[PDB]
Amino acid sequence: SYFQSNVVIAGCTIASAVVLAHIVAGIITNPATALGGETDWAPGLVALAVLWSVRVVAQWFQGRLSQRGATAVIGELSRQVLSSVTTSSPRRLAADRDSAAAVVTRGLDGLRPYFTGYLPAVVLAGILTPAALVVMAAYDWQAAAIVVIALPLIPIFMVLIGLLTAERSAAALTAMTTLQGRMLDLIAGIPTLRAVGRAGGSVQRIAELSASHRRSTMATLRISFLSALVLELLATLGVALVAVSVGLRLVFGDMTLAAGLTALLLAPEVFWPLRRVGAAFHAAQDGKTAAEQALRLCAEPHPPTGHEVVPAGAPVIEVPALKAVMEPGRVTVLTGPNGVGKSTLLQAILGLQESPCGPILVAGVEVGALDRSAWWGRLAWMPHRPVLVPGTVRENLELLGPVPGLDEVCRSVGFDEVLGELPDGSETPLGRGGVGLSLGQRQRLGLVRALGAPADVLLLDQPTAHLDGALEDRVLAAIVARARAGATVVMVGHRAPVLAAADHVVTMESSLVAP
Amino acid sequence: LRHDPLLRLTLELLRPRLGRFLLAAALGVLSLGSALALAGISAWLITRAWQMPPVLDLTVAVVAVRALGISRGVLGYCQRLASHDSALRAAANARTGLYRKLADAPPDEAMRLPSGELVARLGPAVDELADVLVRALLPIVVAVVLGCAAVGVIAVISPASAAVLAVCLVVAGVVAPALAARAAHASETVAAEHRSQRDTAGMLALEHAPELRVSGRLDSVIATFERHHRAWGEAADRAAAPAAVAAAMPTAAMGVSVVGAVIAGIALAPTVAPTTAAILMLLPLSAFEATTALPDAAAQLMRSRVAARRLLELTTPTPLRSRPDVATVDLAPGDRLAVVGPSGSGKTTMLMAIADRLNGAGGETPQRAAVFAEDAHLFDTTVRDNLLVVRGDATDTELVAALDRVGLGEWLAGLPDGLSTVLVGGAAAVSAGQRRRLLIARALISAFPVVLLDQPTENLDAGDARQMLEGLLTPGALFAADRTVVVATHHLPPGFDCPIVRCT
Ligand SMILES: Nc1ncnc2c1ncn2[C@@H]1O[C@H](COP(=O)(O)OP(=O)(O)OP(=O)(O)O)[C@@H](O)[C@H]1O
Numbered sequence A: 001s002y003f004q005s006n007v008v009i010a011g012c013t014i015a016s017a018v019v020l021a022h023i024v025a026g027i028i029t030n031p032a033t034a035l036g037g038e039t040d041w042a043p044g045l046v047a048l049a050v051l052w053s054v055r056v057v058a059q060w061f062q063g064r065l066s067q068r069g070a071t072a073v074i075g076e077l078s079r080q081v082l083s084s085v086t087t088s089s090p091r092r093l094a095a096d097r098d099s100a101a102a103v104v105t106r107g108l109d110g111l112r113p114y115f116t117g118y119l120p121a122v123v124l125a126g127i128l129t130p131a132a133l134v135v136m137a138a139y140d141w142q143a144a145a146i147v148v149i150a151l152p153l154i155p156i157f158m159v160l161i162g163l164l165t166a167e168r169s170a171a172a173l174t175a176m177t178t179l180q181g182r183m184l185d186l187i188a189g190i191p192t193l194r195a196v197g198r199a200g201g202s203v204q205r206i207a208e209l210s211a212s213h214r215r216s217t218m219a220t221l222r223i224s225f226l227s228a229l230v231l232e233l234l235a236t237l238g239v240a241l242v243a244v245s246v247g248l249r250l251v252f253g254d255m256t257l258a259a260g261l262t263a264l265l266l267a268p269e270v271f272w273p274l275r276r277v278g279a280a281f282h283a284a285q286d287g288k289t290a291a292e293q294a295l296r297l298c299a300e301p302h303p304p305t306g307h308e309v310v311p312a313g314a315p316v317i318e319v320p321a322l323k324a325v326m327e328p329g330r331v332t333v334l335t336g337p338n339g340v341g342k343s344t345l346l347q348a349i350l351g352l353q354e355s356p357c358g359p360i361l362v363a364g365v366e367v368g369a370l371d372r373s374a375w376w377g378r379l380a381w382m383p384h385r386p387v388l389v390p391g392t393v394r395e396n397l398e399l400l401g402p403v404p405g406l407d408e409v410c411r412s413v414g415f416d417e418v419l420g421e422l423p424d425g426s427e428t429p430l431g432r433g434g435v436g437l438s439l440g441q442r443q444r445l446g447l448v449r450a451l452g453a454p455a456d457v458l459l460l461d462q463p464t465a466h467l468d469g470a471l472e473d474r475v476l477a478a479i480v481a482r483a484r485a486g487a488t489v490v491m492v493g494h495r496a497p498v499l500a501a502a503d504h505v506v507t508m509e510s511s512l513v514a515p
Numbered sequence B: 001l002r003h004d005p006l007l008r009l010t011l012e013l014l015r016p017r018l019g020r021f022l023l024a025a026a027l028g029v030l031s032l033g034s035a036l037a038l039a040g041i042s043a044w045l046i047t048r049a050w051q052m053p054p055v056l057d058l059t060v061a062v063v064a065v066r067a068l069g070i071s072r073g074v075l076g077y078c079q080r081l082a083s084h085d086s087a088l089r090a091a092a093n094a095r096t097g098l099y100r101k102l103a104d105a106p107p108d109e110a111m112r113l114p115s116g117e118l119v120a121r122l123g124p125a126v127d128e129l130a131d132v133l134v135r136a137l138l139p140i141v142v143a144v145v146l147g148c149a150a151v152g153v154i155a156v157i158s159p160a161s162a163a164v165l166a167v168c169l170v171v172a173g174v175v176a177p178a179l180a181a182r183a184a185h186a187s188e189t190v191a192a193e194h195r196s197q198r199d200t201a202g203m204l205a206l207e208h209a210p211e212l213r214v215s216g217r218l219d220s221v222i223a224t225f226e227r228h229h230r231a232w233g234e235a236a237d238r239a240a241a242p243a244a245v246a247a248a249m250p251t252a253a254m255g256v257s258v259v260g261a262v263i264a265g266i267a268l269a270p271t272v273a274p275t276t277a278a279i280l281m282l283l284p285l286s287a288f289e290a291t292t293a294l295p296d297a298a299a300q301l302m303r304s305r306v307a308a309r310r311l312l313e314l315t316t317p318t319p320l321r322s323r324p325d326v327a328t329v330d331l332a333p334g335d336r337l338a339v340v341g342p343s344g345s346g347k348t349t350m351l352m353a354i355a356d357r358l359n360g361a362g363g364e365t366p367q368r369a370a371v372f373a374e375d376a377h378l379f380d381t382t383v384r385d386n387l388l389v390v391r392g393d394a395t396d397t398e399l400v401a402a403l404d405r406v407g408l409g410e411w412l413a414g415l416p417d418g419l420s421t422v423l424v425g426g427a428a429a430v431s432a433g434q435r436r437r438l439l440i441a442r443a444l445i446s447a448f449p450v451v452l453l454d455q456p457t458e459n460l461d462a463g464d465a466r467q468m469l470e471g472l473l474t475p476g477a478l479f480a481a482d483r484t485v486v487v488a489t490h491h492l493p494p495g496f497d498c499p500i501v502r503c504t
């Protein structure tokens, strides 16, 4: 652990200092004598080298342990932040993402100096310094009592510096999150800016953000280096004070020579660990504030959900607020103006957020009490824009799990005529968001992912978008066939072919929660 | 080397200045000055103030040591400030140059990499490049200069021994960086390739959380995040260890050389010439301090060579297939077009070809045509700033008029800050139809003589889609008189007007 390795290091340092002081004392008192047996110059060097090697080995072991522990802790914290943020309501997720992303990617990595050079430094300062003081007092108590007078100053200086840098740490963290988020957003919108011709105007704002970040970092650095210089001067003056004292007491012959060398060699050992702690504190501050932000993000209560499970088969979904009942085996079309909680109604039926209009009941039992894990296993949901990550077409078809019957679903939806026209088949690379495929082909890929799956309830948010008349008819025929196969289908189309394709139409109106 | 593409890449993006590099090297050389001068003025009770009482000598020695310490501390503070300022300037320049390179390339090339890869390459890689500037350039130039000067100086006292000393110093300062680099490179490649997979799955979980949650694939993404974090940690430890031992070996070499030098300096060295002691305390100390600094420089060399390789592979990706050629369409200043066809025919391709023909490549600053693609971006900024991405000199009255005439007057009236609402999430803060209307308002606010719209009435209302499309294709409803409007649509009414350029 920290204790054993730090004890070994402190003991080795103290013993090396004492041994060196004694040998220089022996050589001074015996300038040209003692050669040819018990030289006190040959056999002491081997002990000094052995102590140095032991100290190096202990430092290596401590570093390995610290690195492993830091990796484990950072991984656990990142997992906590990801599991907390991503499993919340979509509005809260969109609110606090691009801030959880920063602390997860570039923020929590700053905790490595905290575990690999700050905590060991603190432990070594707590161990070696009293031990060095005790050994110096045993050899020459006057020197130790004289040095203990400069000791309390350095902790007070550390307290002042920490009080004055705590806020700058958080300011730098916020600047970093803002810069990363804005850069990602600007890169995401390069095609739009190039289409409108204003592509070269975003480089300027990127430059302003980068300059701001550089200025903040330079300010902090300046403060840190000034603090390090002040600590170095403090320790050097504290050492020189006792150096003067012992030198004066040695010139007039009041003290023994070996005790003087021992005190002079053990004086810097009192103050070195404090300088190391002061240097490590500034390095660890960024990780400290990133971790504090990470726990702030993670510490948020999520609404609880019950363990109720819907019975086997296609259930019945009722929304009494709109007098809507979606029976199994029939297609129900949700229509209304642009903004009356239709996609929100779908997401409330899923259970991702609260219902815009009254309570939602699935087979009697309320949605809020349903076991979400098991409930989502009986659903197939197709949002407005299906997820299409960079990669191949085959990788995107398997993004949301496997498709049992990919060929038949592709034939029914019409995606087989898309794979055929691609020169590489289902292996063509795709860009971000589906670049490399057209909007109708992206919609058909999403429809293949959604329609072909083991599910009893189908939720589709305008499924026939970007499709011409023939493809619209084919897709609606496939949806109607799936409904005829004993499933609950809830379309959110508001066009004539979609409306005249369902056995029930709900005309959900405004003044529900938001317009 | 000069023809290395990585070298040219880091020379452009990380553009340095010779003045700061020379200043840092001079500051290091001057920091060696106190090391030279600790014993260069008060060797014994001879050199300084001839002969003096012991207490006077003690006081002089203490004050000289403290003054030298103060000077070294101030010099180190200045050198650290200069080096870190240079690193920050280089990092900012590299980030700006990377974004400019991305924005100058065709837009489909910027969409090849995921968000996690973009984060991993625009953060730590740029930091590593700035680190290579500072840490690669300073100790190395210092070691080379110090070693060459020391060998040249010692070639006079004993050239036969000068050859041996040069051989030993070169052997040490070559084998230690060689071991450091050979340990660092292979492990750091794996570490980088694991780091730019940990955050890919971990930003995928953040942007698309609800879909993965409903599909039951979020636990897998988080598991991949954890696994790649573990792999990166092991790779970093494997990088660290042998570099540590290879850097520790110079320290033992330094100790042995110092002890041997002192022992040789207690053998008739004060005789003949006392400055031989100063030379003997100057040469090994500086040379071996530089040798001890070298292994970290070699490790930084390898790390940022990997980083620069990643950056270059980000800047220039392999192109995808080319969109099919389309028939040229003649346009008139005031015409209305209704390009139609099936869902794979190439209406968007024809719109872009028409825009390219009208713009006539570069050299035509007044851009004649602009394509408003259906998947256009909604930024995470205010509504006014979202609308001003097209025309930056539009007053709020014009913005409000456009919003009211595209059907978003009631939406804007209900916004907490009106035109200053932040729209957190971009397209996630609005609804499909509202986003479509916002894009139509963007098109309306524009000042382009030719406006090419791509499926502008998608996700719109039943009672507003047909009227909006007819107004778009009416020569006086939304775009008036001298504006050409080309609309690629899927819902053209059966009974209507204006020419059709249907595809196949
Ligand atoms: N963070 C948010 N995410 C989604 N909708 C939001 C958010 N904040 C406010 N809203 C508002 O929620 C309301 C409901 O939008 P919703 O997407 O549920 O409607 P819709 O019926 O699907 O309409 P559309 O025809 O546009 O798809 C809109 O007024 C929208 O602007």
Ligand SMILES: Nc1ncnc2c1ncn2[C@@H]1O[C@H](COP(=O)(O)OP(=O)(O)OP(=O)(O)O)[C@@H](O)[C@H]1O
Binding pocket: A421, A435, A436, A437, A438, A439, A440, A441, A466, B108, B320, B321, B322, B323, B324, B341, B342, B343, B344, B345, B346, B347, B348, B349, B350
């Ligand atoms: N980089 C690319 N981005 C998009 N489509 C591409 C690209 N390269 C080739 N294509 C192909 O070009 C063809 C025409 O696509 P385009 O987007 O022009 O069609 P569209 O008529 O607009 O169809 P839709 O109505 O589905 O949008 C398609 O086969 C498409 O996959």
Ligand SMILES: [Mg+2]
Binding pocket: A342, A343, A344, A384, A461, B431, B432, B433
């Ligand atoms: Mg919607």
Ligand SMILES: [Mg+2]
Binding pocket: A438, A439, B347, B348, B454
């Ligand atoms: Mg298109």
